[PDB]
């Protein structure tokens, strides 16, 4: 829970959810700065999951290519459907 | 392409697909031993993808738990839908 | 030059501080059943990992089964490879299993 | 004691050997358009990574957009957190974009 966006965001989300639970045992309006901060960081974490899924898929699909023109063509013809979810963020 | 099941299987699949392409530029009946070998290794690679997705999800869902009885209960109540695909194997 | 990342590093610390303060009050106040206990980080990690590994083993059992079923149709290396390459499985798992 | 893993280590080597032999013949035979070329490993890796990064950037643009749209409904920290926690997005990407 210390280096990548996935790790950092996942830990922040866990602490926020644990905090909330701790509060019910004993909320605040969102600043625009904080909303922006959460949006950008969360998006980056999701974007990280998408990045690794995309590279994995491209590699698999490009596997059959042997020549440059072959690889180049296959890539440009590609359209990938990628699913990313916050619960998929890796802890470490 | 040298340590985990994901990495090894992904590289074997790439070489097999490249091999096939190389052959069309210039197939054999499956032995039962080889079918078993491919089945077990492929399953292990997929199982590896499932493992990391499952841990990620459990952690996210368990986030709100603060006590032991709380965590224990939440876990036992869990049912996870996990999607794994061969093209998701990570190269490195 | 990641200002957004720095803000999170601080936010994580803020959350830790407060969450440590809140556990303090939860304990001081008597809202922790004597029968129960507040999770230590190491304890939580031990339970979570152990449970995740258990679910993994269930998923692993089920995955192999489906791969076996799909691999039944192939009789050549090329067939099995093409078949596995596009393979996508869905697996459900519960601690009960 | 992984007999299955050992078999793959050998299989990867076998495939490399043969695939190196096959490229040899593909080159010797004239089936490589003078205009074209057989991919070197380092060259292939450079193109694949560069292309993957390009698609990643497109996915990243789209993902942020959807997060922005979803985060529009939240006005408190607790709301946004609960909202993002269950968030699942689907994104399509093509080199064209």
UniProtKB/TrEMBL annotation, chains A, B:
It comes from the Viruses. Belongs to the herpesviridae BLRF2 family. This is 52 protein. The chain holds residues 6 to 102 of 135 of the full protein.
């Amino acid at each position: 829970p210390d280096k990548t966006y996935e790790e950092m965001v996942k830990e922040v989300e866990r602490l926020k959810l644990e905090n909330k639970t701790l509060k019910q045992k004993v909320d605040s309006i969102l600043t625009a700065a904080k909303r922006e901060s959460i949006i950008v960081s969360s998006s980056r974490a999701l974007g990280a999951v998408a990045m690794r899924k995309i590279e994995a898929k491209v590699r698999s699909r490009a596997a059959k290519a042997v020549t440059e023109q072959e690889l180049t063509s296959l890539l440009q013809s590609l359209t990938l459907r990628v699913d990313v979810s916050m619960e998929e963020l890796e802890h470490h």
